[PDB]
Each structure stands twice: as C-alpha cells, then as structure tokens.
Amino acid sequence: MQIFVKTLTGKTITLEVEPSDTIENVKAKIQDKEGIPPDQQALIFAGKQLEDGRTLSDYNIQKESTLHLVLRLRGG
Amino acid sequence: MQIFVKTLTGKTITLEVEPSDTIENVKAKIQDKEGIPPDQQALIFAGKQLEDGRTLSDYNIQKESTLHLVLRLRGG
Amino acid sequence: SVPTWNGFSLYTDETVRNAARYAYDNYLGKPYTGTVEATPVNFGGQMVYRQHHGLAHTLRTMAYAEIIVEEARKAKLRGESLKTFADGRTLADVTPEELRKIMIAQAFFVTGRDDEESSKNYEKYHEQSRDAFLKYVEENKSTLIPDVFKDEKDVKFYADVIEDKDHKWADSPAHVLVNQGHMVDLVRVKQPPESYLEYYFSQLQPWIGSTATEAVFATQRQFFHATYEAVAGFDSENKEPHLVVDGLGRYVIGQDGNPIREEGELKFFSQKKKLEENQRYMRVDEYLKLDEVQKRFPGAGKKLDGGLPGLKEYQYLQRLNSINRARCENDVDFCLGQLQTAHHQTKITPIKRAFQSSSEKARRQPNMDEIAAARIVQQIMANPDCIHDDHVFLNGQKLEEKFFRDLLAKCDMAIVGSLLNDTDIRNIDTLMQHERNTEFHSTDAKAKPVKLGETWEKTIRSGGGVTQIKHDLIFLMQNDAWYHTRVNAIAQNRDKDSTFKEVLITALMTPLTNKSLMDTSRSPAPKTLFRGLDLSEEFKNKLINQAETIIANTTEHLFTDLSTEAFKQIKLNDFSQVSARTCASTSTNIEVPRTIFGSNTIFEILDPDGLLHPKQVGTHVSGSESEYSIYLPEDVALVPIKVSFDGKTGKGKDRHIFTLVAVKSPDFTPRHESGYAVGPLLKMQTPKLEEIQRLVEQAREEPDLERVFNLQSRVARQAKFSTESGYKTFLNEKVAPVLEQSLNGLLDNNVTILGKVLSAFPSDGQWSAFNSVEARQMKIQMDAIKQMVEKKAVLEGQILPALAQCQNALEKQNIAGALQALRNIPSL
Amino acid sequence: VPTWNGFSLYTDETVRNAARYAYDNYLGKPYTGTVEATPVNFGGQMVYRQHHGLAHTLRTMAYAEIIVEEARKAKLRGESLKTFADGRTLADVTPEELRKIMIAQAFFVTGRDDEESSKNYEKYHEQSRDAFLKYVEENKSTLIPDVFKDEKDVKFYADVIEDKDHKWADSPAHVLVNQGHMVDLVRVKQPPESYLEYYFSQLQPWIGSTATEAVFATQRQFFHATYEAVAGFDSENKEPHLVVDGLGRYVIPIRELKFFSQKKKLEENQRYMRVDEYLKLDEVQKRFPGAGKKLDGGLPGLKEYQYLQRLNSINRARCENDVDFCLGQLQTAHHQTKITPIKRAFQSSSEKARRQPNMDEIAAARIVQQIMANPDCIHDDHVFLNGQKLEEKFFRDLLAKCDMAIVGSLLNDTDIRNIDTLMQHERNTEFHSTDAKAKPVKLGETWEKTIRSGGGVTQIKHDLIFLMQNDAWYHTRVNAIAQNRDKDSTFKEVLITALMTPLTNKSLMDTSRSPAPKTLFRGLDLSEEFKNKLINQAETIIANTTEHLFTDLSTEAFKQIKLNDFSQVSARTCASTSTNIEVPRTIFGSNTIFEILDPDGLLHPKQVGTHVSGSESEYSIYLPEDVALVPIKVSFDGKTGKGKDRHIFTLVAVKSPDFTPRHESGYAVGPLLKMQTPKLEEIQRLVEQAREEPDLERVFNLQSRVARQAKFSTESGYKTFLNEKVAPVLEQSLNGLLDNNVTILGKVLSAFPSDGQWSAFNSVEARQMKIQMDAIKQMVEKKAVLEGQILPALAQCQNALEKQNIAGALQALRNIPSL
Ligand SMILES: Nc1ncnc2c1ncn2[C@@H]1O[C@H](COP(=O)(O)OP(=O)(O)O)[C@@H](O)[C@H]1O
Numbered sequence A, B: 001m002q003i004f005v006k007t008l009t010g011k012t013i014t015l016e017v018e019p020s021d022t023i024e025n026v027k028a029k030i031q032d033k034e035g036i037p038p039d040q041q042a043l044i045f046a047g048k049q050l051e052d053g054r055t056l057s058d059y060n061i062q063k064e065s066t067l068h069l070v071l072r073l074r075g076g
Numbered sequence C: 001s002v003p004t005w006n007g008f009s010l011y012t013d014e015t016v017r018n019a020a021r022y023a024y025d026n027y028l029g030k031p032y033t034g035t036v037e038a039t040p041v042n043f044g045g046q047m048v049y050r051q052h053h054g055l056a057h058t059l060r061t062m063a064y065a066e067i068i069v070e071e072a073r074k075a076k077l078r079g080e081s082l083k084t085f086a087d088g089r090t091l092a093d094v095t096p097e098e099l100r101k102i103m104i105a106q107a108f109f110v111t112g113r114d115d116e117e118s119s120k121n122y123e124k125y126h127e128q129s130r131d132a133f134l135k136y137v138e139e140n141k142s143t144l145i146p147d148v149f150k151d152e153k154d155v156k157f158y159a160d161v162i163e164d165k166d167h168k169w170a171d172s173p174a175h176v177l178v179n180q181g182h183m184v185d186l187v188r189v190k191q192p193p194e195s196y197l198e199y200y201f202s203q204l205q206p207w208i209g210s211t212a213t214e215a216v217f218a219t220q221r222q223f224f225h226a227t228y229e230a231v232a233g234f235d236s237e238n239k240e241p242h243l244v245v246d247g248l249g250r251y252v253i254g255q256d257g258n259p260i261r262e263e264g265e266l267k268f269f270s271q272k273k274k275l276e277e278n279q280r281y282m283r284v285d286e287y288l289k290l291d292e293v294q295k296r297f298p299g300a301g302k303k304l305d306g307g308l309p310g311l312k313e314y315q316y317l318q319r320l321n322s323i324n325r326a327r328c329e330n331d332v333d334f335c336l337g338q339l340q341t342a343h344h345q346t347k348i349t350p351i352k353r354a355f356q357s358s359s360e361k362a363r364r365q366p367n368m369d370e371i372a373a374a375r376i377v378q379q380i381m382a383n384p385d386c387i388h389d390d391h392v393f394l395n396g397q398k399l400e401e402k403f404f405r406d407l408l409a410k411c412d413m414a415i416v417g418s419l420l421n422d423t424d425i426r427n428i429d430t431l432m433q434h435e436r437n438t439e440f441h442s443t444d445a446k447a448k449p450v451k452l453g454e455t456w457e458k459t460i461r462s463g464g465g466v467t468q469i470k471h472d473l474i475f476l477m478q479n480d481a482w483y484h485t486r487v488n489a490i491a492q493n494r495d496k497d498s499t500f501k502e503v504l505i506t507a508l509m510t511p512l513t514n515k516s517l518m519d520t521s522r523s524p525a526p527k528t529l530f531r532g533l534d535l536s537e538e539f540k541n542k543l544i545n546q547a548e549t550i551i552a553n554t555t556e557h558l559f560t561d562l563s564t565e566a567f568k569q570i571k572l573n574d575f576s577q578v579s580a581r582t583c584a585s586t587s588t589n590i591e592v593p594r595t596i597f598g599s600n601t602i603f604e605i606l607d608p609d610g611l612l613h614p615k616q617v618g619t620h621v622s623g624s625e626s627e628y629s630i631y632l633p634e635d636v637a638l639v640p641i642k643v644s645f646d647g648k649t650g651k652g653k654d655r656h657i658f659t660l661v662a663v664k665s666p667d668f669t670p671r672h673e674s675g676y677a678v679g680p681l682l683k684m685q686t687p688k689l690e691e692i693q694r695l696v697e698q699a700r701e702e703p704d705l706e707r708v709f710n711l712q713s714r715v716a717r718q719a720k721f722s723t724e725s726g727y728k729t730f731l732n733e734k735v736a737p738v739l740e741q742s743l744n745g746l747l748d749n750n751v752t753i754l755g756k757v758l759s760a761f762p763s764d765g766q767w768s769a770f771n772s773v774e775a776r777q778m779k780i781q782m783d784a785i786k787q788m789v790e791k792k793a794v795l796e797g798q799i800l801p802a803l804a805q806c807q808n809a810l811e812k813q814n815i816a817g818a819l820q821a822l823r824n825i826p827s828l
Numbered sequence D: 001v002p003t004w005n006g007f008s009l010y011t012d013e014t015v016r017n018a019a020r021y022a023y024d025n026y027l028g029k030p031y032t033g034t035v036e037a038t039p040v041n042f043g044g045q046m047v048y049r050q051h052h053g054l055a056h057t058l059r060t061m062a063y064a065e066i067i068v069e070e071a072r073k074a075k076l077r078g079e080s081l082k083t084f085a086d087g088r089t090l091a092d093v094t095p096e097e098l099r100k101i102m103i104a105q106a107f108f109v110t111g112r113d114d115e116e117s118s119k120n121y122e123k124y125h126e127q128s129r130d131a132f133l134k135y136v137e138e139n140k141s142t143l144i145p146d147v148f149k150d151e152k153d154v155k156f157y158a159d160v161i162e163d164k165d166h167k168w169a170d171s172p173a174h175v176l177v178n179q180g181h182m183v184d185l186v187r188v189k190q191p192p193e194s195y196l197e198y199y200f201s202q203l204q205p206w207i208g209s210t211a212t213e214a215v216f217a218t219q220r221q222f223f224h225a226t227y228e229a230v231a232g233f234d235s236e237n238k239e240p241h242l243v244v245d246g247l248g249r250y251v252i253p254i255r256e257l258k259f260f261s262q263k264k265k266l267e268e269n270q271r272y273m274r275v276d277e278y279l280k281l282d283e284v285q286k287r288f289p290g291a292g293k294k295l296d297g298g299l300p301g302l303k304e305y306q307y308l309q310r311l312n313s314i315n316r317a318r319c320e321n322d323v324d325f326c327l328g329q330l331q332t333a334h335h336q337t338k339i340t341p342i343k344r345a346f347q348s349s350s351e352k353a354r355r356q357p358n359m360d361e362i363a364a365a366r367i368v369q370q371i372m373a374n375p376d377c378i379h380d381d382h383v384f385l386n387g388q389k390l391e392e393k394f395f396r397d398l399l400a401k402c403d404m405a406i407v408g409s410l411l412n413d414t415d416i417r418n419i420d421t422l423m424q425h426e427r428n429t430e431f432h433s434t435d436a437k438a439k440p441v442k443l444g445e446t447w448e449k450t451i452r453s454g455g456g457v458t459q460i461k462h463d464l465i466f467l468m469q470n471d472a473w474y475h476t477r478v479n480a481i482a483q484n485r486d487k488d489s490t491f492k493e494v495l496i497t498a499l500m501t502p503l504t505n506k507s508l509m510d511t512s513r514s515p516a517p518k519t520l521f522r523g524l525d526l527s528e529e530f531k532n533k534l535i536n537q538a539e540t541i542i543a544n545t546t547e548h549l550f551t552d553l554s555t556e557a558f559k560q561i562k563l564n565d566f567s568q569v570s571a572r573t574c575a576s577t578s579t580n581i582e583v584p585r586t587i588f589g590s591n592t593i594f595e596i597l598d599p600d601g602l603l604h605p606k607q608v609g610t611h612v613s614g615s616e617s618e619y620s621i622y623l624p625e626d627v628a629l630v631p632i633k634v635s636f637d638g639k640t641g642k643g644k645d646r647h648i649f650t651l652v653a654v655k656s657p658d659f660t661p662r663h664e665s666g667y668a669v670g671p672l673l674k675m676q677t678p679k680l681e682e683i684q685r686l687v688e689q690a691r692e693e694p695d696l697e698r699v700f701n702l703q704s705r706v707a708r709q710a711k712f713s714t715e716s717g718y719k720t721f722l723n724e725k726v727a728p729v730l731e732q733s734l735n736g737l738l739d740n741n742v743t744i745l746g747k748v749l750s751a752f753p754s755d756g757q758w759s760a761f762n763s764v765e766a767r768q769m770k771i772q773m774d775a776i777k778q779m780v781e782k783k784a785v786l787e788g789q790i791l792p793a794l795a796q797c798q799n800a801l802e803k804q805n806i807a808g809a810l811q812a813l814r815n816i817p818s819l
C-alpha cells in the first residue's frame, strides 16, 4: 500500500507503507525521504489531525489516501 | 348533739350542735361562749385540722366527740 | 427481749423525792445523837449535821441504782451475759416499779445511824433504819399501798433488805442495788484509791459487766463533782501497800521476788502481824499487774486525774468548801437537780467524744453553690414569666425539676435564705399572681387540690409591707396543710407524684420562709423542743431499734474507750434526716404534739449547745402552738439518748418519746459535688457581645469600587470639557491621581496606600476655589470616596491590628501590654 | 437568486485576454479617419483614442458588472425589475452569460475609424462586429469549446455589437452592452443634470432606483479611478434644460410635454425651460431623486490645480494603454465601493485599539492571578478562594462578558511563571477533545512531558501558544467552551479555558512582533443548515449595502447588519487564522472560509509559531467587542474532499460604538470584594476568651486552704493576717466573679496583700498559697480589665463607627479610663 502526503509548498511525497505502521513511523519515513523532523511534522487527513501512537487502521486511512503535512514549530 | 372542744389552757367547752353544722358555725359558737375570734381558731380532730365550709358530719364528728382548739395567729 | 423503759427517773418521780424529803426532815437533817464525829460542820455558813452519811450520800446511792439498772439494760442489749439471781433474772430485768421500791428503801438505809461509828453497832443502826422505813410506809400507807408497795409482804421484803440481818447482799436485785449502791459511795474516803476501786469494781462487774461498771464509776465521779465531794486520782504505779479490802489485810512478798501464795491463791495477812526481816507487803502496782487482776480490772497501766479539770488545788478546795455543798446536803430538790444535770451530761459527753469536735455554733458561711442558688432564686422571683409548666427558662438556660430537687437536697436553704433580700419577699406577691391557678395537692390523697396563688391572694396575704408578707408566708407554713405537707415531703425527698411547680415552689419558698423566720423571730432560742410525728408502727419500731442500739452503744468509761463503736452504731442507725431538709415544725409545749395532734411519735429535741437556731413561728399567747421552726444544719445530728413508752394516743396506738441531742461535728457533714448551681448561673451570665458582632460585621462591608471607577469616568468627561477657572486642570492634576490611587489601594487592599491617599485628598478650601454645580457634586462624591478609604485605612490599618495586639497580649496575660495595644496606636 | 461563483471582471483571464486583443489590435491603433484622429498626450505617453478607447471600454465592462450586481441585490431586496420577453430579469444573468456580454463589450467600439458621430454609424458597427468575429476565430479553439456554446451564440453577440435595428432592449446582452456604453457618456455633457436624469431614466426600469444610484455613484468612483473628469451637479442650475432624446428644449410650461427643436424660434415673452424647473416637475421627482441635491465636482481634498495636475498625470495614459493597470484601478475602486457604505452606516471610531479595562475585567484579572498563585483553590467541582466558591457559571460568565484579551493585558510575567505550577497541580486532570472518538489526555502531564521546554517567561509563552496551536484535545475543548458551544465539558475544562484564554492572549500580545496582516483566512466546518443561514444573512446584508448619490440608505444597512450579523462565530476565543487560504481550504478541507479583511487594523492579530515555508502561517484573532466582521461577498468555491460545497465569505472588520454590547457590571467585582473580607480570627478568639467561665473551683480550693490554716495555726500574725487580709479578698473575689460586678472587681485588686506582706512568713504553705493568690489576682485583674476597660471601649468604637465618627472611634481605644 502506498500513500501520498502533500505539503503546503506543493511538493508531494509518496510513502509505500503498511497499515500496521504507526504515524510516528510515518513521520520517521517523511524524515528519511525529505529530512523533515517529526517534531515539525503535523499530519492531517480529512480535516483531522493524526496523533502519534495510533496507527493508520485506527484512522480509516486506506489505499492511495492523501495526507497533508505542515511544519508546526514554536515561536522564538 | 353535744361535743366538747378542749383547749390547751385546760378549759373544756361544751357545744350544742347538729352534724350539718359547718366549721365556721362551730367557730362562731366557740366565739359566743369564750370570746375567741374565729380567725384565731384552729380546730383539730383526730390530729386533723377542720376546714371552713365543711361540716361536722363530713369529718365524722358525732355525739360527744372531742375537738381541740389552739390559737393560731400571724406574727406581729 | 429487753422491755422498753417508761421514763421512770429518780429526778422526775414524785414518790421517791417525797421519801428523800421524809428521810432528811426526819433523820438526815437532824444532828447525830451519838459520839463518833457527831460534831456538825459548816459549809459557807450553813450547818451540815451528817456529812459522810447524810442526804447527798443517800441521793447519790439512789442515782447509782438508777444508772446501774440502765447500764445493765444496755449491756444485755449489746448481747452481754449477766449474772443471774436464783429466779434467773439479771439486773436488766428490774422493772421501774421495782426500782421505785428499791430507791425508796435506799432512802432509809442510813437513817438509823446515830453517829459515824462503824463495825460496832451495825445491827442497831440498820434496825433503826428499818424502823424509820416502816414508820414512813405506815404514815403514808394511804399512798404507798398498794400503788407502790402492793402488800405488807413487799414492805417487809424491802425493810428486810434495809435491816441486812444475814449480809445476803446478792439475794435479789434489791439487795445488790441497795448494798452495792451504798458500797459505790465509799470510794472517796478510802485510801489507797486503787485497791478500793479494784475491789468495788470486782463486786459490781459480774452483775452488769465491765463496760457497764466503767460507766457506773465514771458517772459516780461526775456525781461527786456534782455534789461537791472530793474525787481522788488513780495511779496504777502507786507504791503504797495494797490493802486487801475483804478483811483490811495485806499480801506479802518474801525474801525472794515472790508474793506469798497458798496451795494458787494469795495468802491473807493481818496488818498488825509483824513478820520477818526482808519480808514486805505487796504494793498497789504489783497487785494491779497480776494476771488475775488484769483479766478482771481494766485499770492496769491507767492513770486518773484527781479533782476537777480546769481548777488548781486552791480553787478545787475553795469549791469543796462552797455553800453549795450544804445545799446538796440539805436541799433534796437541789441535790437532785445537781445529780439530774450530771446524769444528763453523761449521756452527751460520750456522743461528743465519739466524733470530731466543733467550736463554732453558727451555720457555716455560704458556698459557691448556695450563693449561685440564691441568685437564681432572686431572678426567678424578679421575673416569674420564666416559669413554664415543665421547666424554668432563665437567661438561655433550662432548669428542670431535678435541678430544683438538687437545690433542696444539696443546699442549706436557710443559708440561701440569709442571702435573699426584702425585694424578693415583695416579689412573692407577683409570683403568686403568676401562679394564681397552680393546683397544689396535699399529701392527704382524699383532700382536694388548692389553687396556690389564688389562695395566697384571697386568704393568706393581708396587705402591708415586707414584714407582714413574712408573717403571712410563715402563717401559710403554719396553717395550710395542703401546702406544708407537700412542701415538706418534697424537701425531704419523700414525695410521691408531685408536679413540677410544686417542686419549684418548694425550692423557692423554703429559703424565703427561712429568711422570713430569721428576720421576724426575736424570741430567745429554746433548748428543749417537741416534734410530733404520726408514723407507721413498722417505721416507728425501726426507729426504736435504731435508737436503742445507739443508746446501748453510747457509754461512759474510765479506762476503756468504746467511742469507735458509738461512731459505728450512730452512723448505722442515725435517723436525723427525719427532721432534716425542711422547715420542721416544733413546739416548747409537748401537749401540742401529744394532746392536740395525737402524734404517736414525739422527738424531744435537746439543743444544749445552741446548734439548731430555731425561729419563732406565729404568736405565743397562752393556748397557742408555741411553735418554733428548725432547719437542721448539715453537720448537726439528732442523736437519741432515751426512748420512752408514753402511753396510748386517742386512737389507741402506742406513743413513744425519743429524746434527741443536737450534736455538731464535721463527721456529719455530707459530701456533695460542687457545681449543681454554679454551672447554670455562669452559663446564664455568659455575655451577649452584640457590639463586637456589629463591629466585625462593619469590618466585613465591601467598598463600592464600581462607584470609584464610574467616578473616574465622571471626572474624565467632566474634564473633557473645561468650564471654570482652575476646575479641569485641577481635576486632571489633583483629583484623578487620588482616584487612581484609591481605586488601586482599595483594589489591592493595601492600607499604607490608603493611609497616605487619605493625606492626598484635597482640602475643602481647594474645592471652594470652584463654585460650579458639577464641581459641588464632585466634591460631595470625593467626600464619599474619602470616607470609603478612611474606613479601610482606619479599620484595617489602625483598629483591627490594635485588637489583634490586645488579644495576643491577653493570651500571654500581659494586660499592661493589652491596654498599651489600644492606647499606643500609631497614626497613618 | 443563485449564489455567485466568484467570477469577476478583474480576475477572469478570458475577459482580460479579449481586452488585450482589442487594445492590441484596434483600440491602441490610431484613427484612420478624420474626426479627432489627432492623438493626445498625457504626461509624455500618447493616447490615440481618448474618448472611445481602452479605458472607456474597460469602464463599460465594469458598468455591466455592477449593473448585474446591483440588479441581483434589488431582486434580493424584493424589487420588481423590468422583464424581458422570456420573463427573465437582469438579475438572471449567469456568470457565463456575463462573461460573454463583457467579451462583446470589449469590441463594441473597436470598429471605429474616428470620432464621427452620426454619419457612418452602421459602418463602424459593421467593422466592430467583424473585429469581434475575427477575435473569436483566432482563438476559436479555446473558447467555443468553452465560453460560447456554438457559432449561433457568437452570431448572437456579434448581432448585438452590430446593432442593425437599434433593438437595444431585446435581451440582457443588448441592455448591458448598449446601456453600459451609455453610462460612460456621463463625462462630456451640457449640462450634467439633464443627461444624468436621462440615463438614470434609461437604466432605472431594469434594475431599480436604488440600484441606479449605486451604479452612477460607483461610476464616478471609476472615473476618479481612471483619471476622467467628474462633473458637479446643481439642482438649482439656471442653464436651460436640454431634452436628450433629439437634442431639443421645452419652453414656458407648454405641453400636449411639448417637444421643441432648438432652431424653432418662437414667441415674445416665451422662454426655454430651465434645468431646475425640469427637476422640480412632479413627474421628474417621482422618478429622479436628484431634486434638491448638489454634488461637488472633482475630488474632495484637492483644489482645481491639484485635481487638474492629476487629470494630466501619466496614469491616465496607463489607464488608456495598460490593461492590467486600468483593471487594477477599477478593481480597487470596485472593492472600495463595497466598504464605504458600511463604515458610512455606523458611528465612526477614532481609536483603533481595544478600550481600557473596565471594573469587572480588572477584578477578573485579579481573580485569575490569585488562582494562578494558589492552585490549591482548585477542586473538581469549584474554585475555593479566600472563603469564596466560584462555580462553572462564574468562569463561563468571565468568558462571555469579559474581553479576555484585556484581562490578559492586566496579567504579568509572574502569572505566566505560575502556569507551570498550575499544570503541576493538574498533572492528572483529564482533558477531552470534542472528537469523542479520540482518547482523553492528561493535562499537566502532557504539559510537563511534551509541551513545556524550560527557559524563561517568554519561552513559557511560546510553549502555551504551541499548546493552543498543536494539541487538538486542548484547543477544541478550549475554543468550544469560550464560544459557549461546548457539550459535556468538565468544570476543570471550563476553568482551564477561563484562565488560559487571557494567559494565551498575554502570550501572543507579548511575543508577537510581525506587522499585522490585512487579509486573513479562517476555516470552519459548519453544518449545511448553519452555513445556509450564514449565506442568507450575508446575502441580505450585501443586498442592503449600496452606494448612493442622493438617497442615503445607511439606516437600512444598519438595520439589516444588526439583524444578520454573525461576527460572534469568530468571537470570544483565540480564533485560528492563516494568511494562506490553502491552510483552511486544502489542509483542513473546511467547507466554510472567512476572507477577513482588516484594512484599518482593528483585529490586532498575533502571530502563532513560526512562518517557515510549509508552516500554517497562523495568526490568532480575539475579536474586539466593538468590531464587526461585515460580509461584502459570498462566493461558491467548489467542493471539499468530502464533496461538500465550499463557500468563501469575505468579511471587512468595522469598528464602531454601535457594535459595543450592553453588559451589566458586577459579575466579577462582587466575588473579589468577598475575597477582601477579613476572617478576623483574633477577634473571634477575643470574644471566645471573654466568654470563658471563671475558675471558681480554684477560688474555693484556696478558701479551703485559708480555712484549714487559719482555724489551726499557733502563729498570731499569720492567723490574723489570713483571717483578716486574705479570706476577705477571697470571699469578695468569689462573689465578684459569680455576679460579674466590675466595680467590686476593680477595687479588690488593691485589697490583695503585697509580696512583702506574704514574705513576712517563710512557711511552705505560705509560699504555696501566695502562688495561688497571685494566680487569682491575675484572674480578677484580667476579668475586670476586659469588662471594665476593653469591651466598653470596643462598644464605643463600634458605635462611633456606625455613626461615621472615625476620630471619636480612635478616641474610644486611645482614651481608656483607669480604675
Ligand atoms: N462486797 C460487797 N458487796 C455488797 N455490799 C457491800 C460490799 N462491801 C460493803 N458493802 C456495803 O457496805 C456496807 C458497810 O458500809 P460502812 O459500814 O459505812 O463501811 P465499812 O464497810 O467501811 O464499814 C454494808 O452494809 C454493805 O451493804
């Protein structure tokens, strides 16, 4: 199974993973393929934020679903 | 019917009376015979004081019964 | 198994006195027609012809016989086995009639003496005495017989006792009493004292017992004192040679330390028998230490003071030569009065000897609980509205029935009365109005209820001032049995089915009646009162047993002090509470309890030490009840000394007279727990501190900050437009800062900012620079804010801290610092 | 009335391309004819055709745009508009149809070879039509398959352009093209009043009078936007009125109104009708609101020399020569005509910043600081502060009645520091997302272990902001409670919201340095029912928001805006926004987007987090109480990922005292006042101590000791001393304590023996008793001082206080009489 996480810059990252993968692991893959640390990673699907520790199967994220990644940092 | 009222001085007064005579009336008779005002008269019979308004027959005082007279006054 | 006495006394019986008058007027008072010591003697100017064997001696022998029979009766009651005569009778079995005959004989026992002469002439002297007796009986045959003597066989019996033909001094009670009564008078003239005392003691002791015999000889010394006869001492270590009285001989101690005894048994020796070298008479102390003597004579080791206590030999001697010796030897009624007073005193001294002594005769001072009780009474009386059918409600405290009964039982309500005043007596009328319709129930369950306050208003109360109220209250106590039966029963805690208001009225009227009596009685305190009671046969018989036990265990002594047992029996059998706790009615005329009321029980209450403090009740005209009221003090006991059968009442029940002596002692004080009255009084006085409550409620008021902030808005729009010279600049520069400061100060709660912003408010003169309308309203609002800040800066900054300092300075007991806290307040 | 799709003359590419083509091929080329073929020069740049060139054409297009707009509004206001033969009104123009109309309008004048009026009209329109068809053919590929359905359509619009039979009212195309051209004539007339009345009379039936005022007002603003001269308007002008139909005159008034040609010279004492006389006629006033009114020429704030120096600026030639520039000018003017009526309908405000704090906000701030300072006041059911219980309703009242941003301005950095301790107190407090499927999260533990990052107060502020921004289990509940739209919230959730909203506002305010943006985008996922409500409200407001010339409809705009305001949807919480519409549209798939325009800086947005590439570019708005988000446009923007319809509401922030809400003071000041109420424990202990019962038991014990010693004693002066100096003071003291009489108590103190009178005797019991006599002396001295000195002075103080005599109240405590 492969999914596509699009970002605000327009880049579309593709990650082929299995539903047992956790979003923490998805954040790790997004790091390896692009270099974006998971502490800057905000993952959205169908207007719902994904919380770390739960897996894709908990969020009904399925075949070729597209999640969205935005960088979310503290100020200063 | 005649009764005897004995006093502390030793005198024995004899009174002709009826069993219906009230204690007020007996005191009046002792007054007439001796000059003792009834407000100073305390009449005892069988160790019991006689109440004004009650009668001789009420107190079982019968023929030749003996009552006792003591002077009882307030102080001053 | 011992019969009750009937009150026969040597000192009240007329017949015996007449016999003594006859003996004196006929023989005693006449001079000795003989030789030996016939020379008369003079005492304080009066002649006494017979001095050793005259009137006083005879009367003393009669007194001896009386107390010997008495002590025999007591000893038998204590369970002692007494020596019996041939008919099985002991001296205890002597009837009063028999004692009268014996005493009449005793009167003539010495009349036949022509001089003092002794052993020679003894028959004659008794023969003539016998004749003197017989003559008397014959001259008074009309009266003596049979009323006294029954038959001429009896008269010859007692005459035969007087004659003493065959020295059978123990044939009958009459023989023992006449002969031993005569012997009991010989102690005084008979040195050495110890040998004689032991002898006579040994002669009496078998008949009545050792305890009884000690009582006899002690009472005898008191009779000697009463009749101005010398009283010797007694030294168990006397070295003078012992005298063997039976035969006026001696016992001897030989070359060794041994008393010469027989085959043991002490060898008799004549006095004139001169015997061996280094052989010596046995001394008095050696005799008194012999085992055989100690087993029968308690005088071993003991010493007795001669003469009178409190007098030295010149005073004692000048007393023995007083003229009253001649009145005792010449005046039958006088010598009998002396002996009567001595005999009576020997009935009190043992009682007072068994308990702690008391010096003070007056009721004690009030205690905590009595003072509190008095206050509570005064307040109930001042405000009768506090009286509810179930309780009294005073100053937030609920007083139930048990409280007032505890008042009745634990307080000396006479003392409480002493703590009351005439305004409470005056308030009785108001109380009675409040209790106009309170039914009062006599203890006679047949008699009807009586309305208390109505009967008071309409029949008892007679107008006038406080004294008349007191006499009215006393008259209620004296006249109305529906009142005093219930009241007395409640005070003595023997009431059945009493209402609360009856208990309360009892609790209020007992001290009020005591104050009434105390204030209105001027009579001298009598020393003999009579109280009448109509008791059940069962309860009276219980009182008879208690009393006779007490009497039997109250004895005089010489050597053996049985006080502890008197204590035990008096404390077991005391019935003083029968006359305690209430205003007990008494009279000086025994015919009021005996004849008027037909009481079966009479308490002859003797107060020789003035301990009862009785008060006069009502009038004392002839024919009155002669009534006095006693409220028994807590430490005074009515100890019985005599119980007499006095005959039958009108209803044919038996009547007894208990003679009671008031005795005061801390041993009779009761143990009560303090606080029964003080507690409720202190709670009644716990302060309502409403002023401090309103002070704290005032320190809890919230400031109106909304008014201050809105006021800043007002000053702003006020200042937006400037209309007057120096109004708006001033507003901006002098007002708005104080409003910001105040709002903040208030807002913050700081009191320093508030204290100095108080200094920041403008003067009235700086405002008077502006006379605009909104300027005036502004100054009124600024005055309101200054008040709002002044309240906080003064309370929180000055007052409340000064009270904290005061309180802390009080919990440390530094009162000077506490008043410093309020006085030394720094300004702002 | 259908919802628009956001089709604008100023954004649609096709229309701009057609205008480029027209300029490029015709309008920018010189006149091959005679009349006014002579070019004109503006600031160095040449305009070849100035009266009938590019700027004129673009203005005709803009006219058709606002004519359709105002017609739509008038239909929405319920106005009856003139129908075409098929029953359709001008409101019924679709965006596709309008695009076709405007595209045609581009070429309506291309076929002009000069300025000649009357002769050679037909030829110039023939040439215009040919030019149009040429354009269509050249790009036929692009648009016939798109914009025109077929060649019949193209022949339709070409037939409108040609104008063969002067059928100027057959269709929307004819009215819009011809009347749009007619409107642009309001520039060179003599005199303006007669012509303006005429054109007004021409347009009014189709769209209505209100709409027509809007059109010509907006037209003057387009003139200013395109550097064309703007005439005045005097209803009291004395110049003779000219009848526009036929360039004639009326004379006085002679009716059959009798037409007159100009050249018909007529009678003595007979004169042409004046323009003001024309405007005062009943029939004219019934249809033209210009009666009595005057309009100033030129620009307000410019005198004729500055205005004139503007008309010759180069921007006139940029407008006549630069399609993108003239379209930008018209776009900015068109946008401004949507705002000016709104600010015109409400009271103006001079200050742009939040008001100063009011009493309840100040008190609220204090209560927040005290709660933060002592979290122990926090129980699961309530807050218990200084003997006062604040329940859920209190904190909801704070959230609803207080401007929590102002409250935050009243907090300090110590409260920020106390955030950490508060989170420690709530280490294990469950927080529930509005997503009931998501798990509960431990508040303080998540704070300590994942949010908080050490550092100083500023870093705590950025941590809190990061919390609000990142953790939906927090900000969903928090936002929902602040807007009073929460369901099944715990009290600690309401409390945490109530404390965290002002603290977050302080965090943002203190930490935000960016210059405030003027266009923010907010995403909402609303129900179809609620969104439709918002659509109706907005479209109502827009329909009653119009420009004017003579008739000021501000009152109705006011009325409808206050009836249909939905500013509260963005109020009461720290609402999240972004500068990138793709954050709410693309990332979160919201079906509702607020294009919030703050051209006057009234929203005070604060920056949230970082704005790196790929960030949410988030700013946070806490709506001020007197700012309204007034809709000016509602656009359908397509469908979301879930296939729901997405709309964009464009909202303009307007600040006015009219939008201020009426609240009742005291909701917060009260509890704060209760908190300053003292307990006065020391005074409670003073009265409890003044209620102590005296220890008479000790007095009796001492009386017993004195009794048993004075009854038995061989000493003479110790027995006389005891029975005469000691026992009386004990009896009197016992009585004074039993009766509480302060007079006896005050003087028995002098009766106690001295330590020297006791010291004369060195017995053991003498000392043992002297200790007790001193203890009782302390007892009665203590009692006689309270009742005799203190309590009466406290009564005097209190009485002097309820009387407002403060100086005498302090006298009561200072002036204590001795005994
Ligand atoms: N042991 C005794 N028992 C009874 N009576 C006695 C006893 N001894 C003496 N008496 C009485 O004392 C009387 C003698 O008294 P009196 O002649 O005056 O004294 P004395 O014995 O010294 O000569 C006798 O008649 C006798 O009654």
Ligand SMILES: Nc1ncnc2c1ncn2[C@@H]1O[C@H](COP(=O)(O)OP(=O)(O)O)[C@@H](O)[C@H]1O
Binding pocket: D117, D118, D168, D175, D177, D178, D179, D181, D182, D202
């Ligand atoms: N009542 C009207 N309705 C529609 N369009 C009109 C009306 N009156 C004038 N027009 C428009 O005005 C245009 C005339 O403009 P033009 O020839 O440039 O100026 P002039 O009118 O000075 O000759 C016509 O093409 C016509 O479409």
